[PDB]
């Protein structure tokens, strides 16, 4: 999908 | 910026550590006499290279998700720009896993906890990266000689993560501030508990960096022979951090 680090960081 | 504030920082980090430690120290300790049989070792040793890599990558990455949760909980970490968060995580997440490893390591027989039992280095032979495994078990063994507490693991690994010298940082000075206070919390808890004798006993800096580079090198050789394994089979988080 893309950019799993971004996701982990944004997700409360 | 206050004594009371750094007392709170010690408390904050220790508790944050316990909530993100993946397994409690004594669930590891209690399982030490569960040792992989000779027949179970040859089963692991009969897995292909890519199959051992992906089983290992999987477990590493579930450990790394805990480390990411831990970092998120370190003071000021979320108030840094996303570039720098990613930089601290790419440089530190593996370092933290290597430190967290000493918990899951039995110095008596040099074994680590893996898939429900303890195995030695030989358990990992199908990975094809044997100087590295030996280096990692050596590091883990020198760390065990320190006899860290859970609190000391918390404070130290917070410090491996929050480092203003990491290359690639945009806002170096914001992270110096963050690190400075965690340096203080760590030093504070050691003089309170009359450790501090372990400050010169701690690894360099270098050392961990050398361990991490070696892992990436090894991964890179692996990718040469199996390019699309990493891109399609490995957890994305692992791919993102390491290649
Ligand atoms: C990815 C691979 C090619 C390099 C790493 C090889 C290794 C040193 O064997 C890795 C593979 C799986 C790893 C383990 C997987 C999960 C945990 C539990 C965690 O709470 C602390 C560390 C620990 C115990 C890891 C230590 C290092 C291990 C045991």
Name the CA dihedral angle for B135, B141, B142, B145, rounded to a multiple of 10 degrees. 180
Torsion angles phi and psi, residue A11, rounded to 5: -75, 100
Q: Are A5 and B237 inside 8 Å of each other by CB?
A: yes
Q: Which residue has tokens 């918990």?
A: B103
Q: B229 burial class (0-12, 13-18, 19+ CB within 10 angstroms)?
A: middle
User: Residues of B with CB below 8 A from A7's CB?
Assistant: none
What kind of fold does domain B1-243 have according to CATH?
Retinoid X Receptor (1.10.565)
Domain-by-domain residue ranges, chain B?
1-243
Q: Which residue has tokens 């579930």?
A: B62
Interface mutation target, options A5, A6, A7, chain B, most CBs of B under 10 Å = A5
DSSP state of B94: H
Q: What is the resolution of this structure in A?
A: 2.3
| A5: nearest CA partner in chain B | B237
Judged by a CB distance cut-off of 8 A, whether residue B89 touches chain A is: yes
d(CA B51, CA B126): 9
């Amino acid at each position: 999908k893309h950019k799993i680090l971004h996701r982990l960081l944004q997700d409360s | 910026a206050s004594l009371t504030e750094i007392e709170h920082l010690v408390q904050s980090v220790c508790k944050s550590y316990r909530e993100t430690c993946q397994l409690r120290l004594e669930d590891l300790l209690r399982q030490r006499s569960n040792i992989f049989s000779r027949e179970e070792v040859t089963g692991y040793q009969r897995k292909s290279m890519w199959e051992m890599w992906e089983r290992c990558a999987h477990h590493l990455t579930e450990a790394i998700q805990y480390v990411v949760e831990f970092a998120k909980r370190l003071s000021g970490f979320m108030e840094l720009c996303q570039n720098d968060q990613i930089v601290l995580l790419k440089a530190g997440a593996m370092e933290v896993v290597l430190v967290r490893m000493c918990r899951a390591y039995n110095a008596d027989n040099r074994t680590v906890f893996f898939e429900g039992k303890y195995g030695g280095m030989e358990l990992f032979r199908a990975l094809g990266c044997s100087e590295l495994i030996s280096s990692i078990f050596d590091f883990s063994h020198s760390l065990s000689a320190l006899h860290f507490s859970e609190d000391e693991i918390a404070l130290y690994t917070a410090l491996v993560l929050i480092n203003a010298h990491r290359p690639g940082l945009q806002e170096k000075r914001k992270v110096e501030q963050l690190q400075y206070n965690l340096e203080l919390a760590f030093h504070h808890h050691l003089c309170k508990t009359h450790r501090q004798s372990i400050l010169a006993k701690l690894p360099p800096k270098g050392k961990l960096r050398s361990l991490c580079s070696q892992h990436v090198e090894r991964l890179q050789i692996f990718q040469h022979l199996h390019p699309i394994v990493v891109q399609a089979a490995f957890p994305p988080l692992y791919k993102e951090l390491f290649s």
